[PDB]
Amino acid sequence: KQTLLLVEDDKNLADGLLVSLEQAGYECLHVERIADVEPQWKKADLVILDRQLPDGDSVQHLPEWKKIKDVPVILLTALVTVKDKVAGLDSGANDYLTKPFAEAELFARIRAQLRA
Ligand code: BEF
Ligand SMILES: [Mg+2]
Numbered sequence: 001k002q003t004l005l006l007v008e009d010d011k012n013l014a015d016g017l018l019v020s021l022e023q024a025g026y027e028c029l030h031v032e033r034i035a036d037v038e039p040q041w042k043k044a045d046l047v048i049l050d051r052q053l054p055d056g057d058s059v060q061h062l063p064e065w066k067k068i069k070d071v072p073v074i075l076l077t078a079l080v081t082v083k084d085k086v087a088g089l090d091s092g093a094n095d096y097l098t099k100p101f102a103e104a105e106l107f108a109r110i111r112a113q114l115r116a
Pocket of ligand 1: 009050051052053076077078079099
């Protein structure tokens with residue numbers, strides 16, 4: 001069994017999301033602030049990361065998050081500009097996928113981050 005962590009302030013988006021991954025045979029964590037990622041970063045084998053929480057930007061903490069544990073990070077945010085893409089990808093994100101998004105593709109990019 002594999003463990004992912006969902007960092008998302010959008011509840012209802014996280015609502016229908018946290019069920020498909022469970023149907024994919026996972027155990028997940030949900031987080032809606034930046035004051036809740038550090039307690040759970042050491043727990044998941046992959047982080048699905050939303051940028052603008054009510055705390056601020058989550059990419060600013062991403063490097064200091066990444067060196068606690070080299071965890072694959074997938075940035076799922078409504079920041080679609082290429083300037084935002086190069087920001088997260090270089091900050092330590094193994095992938096970057098914008099909103100709106102495909103569940104079958106997000107799962108494929110998760111199935112691609114966990115084969116090593
Ligand atoms: F509000 Be998130 F970054 F999509
Ligand atoms: Mg958000």
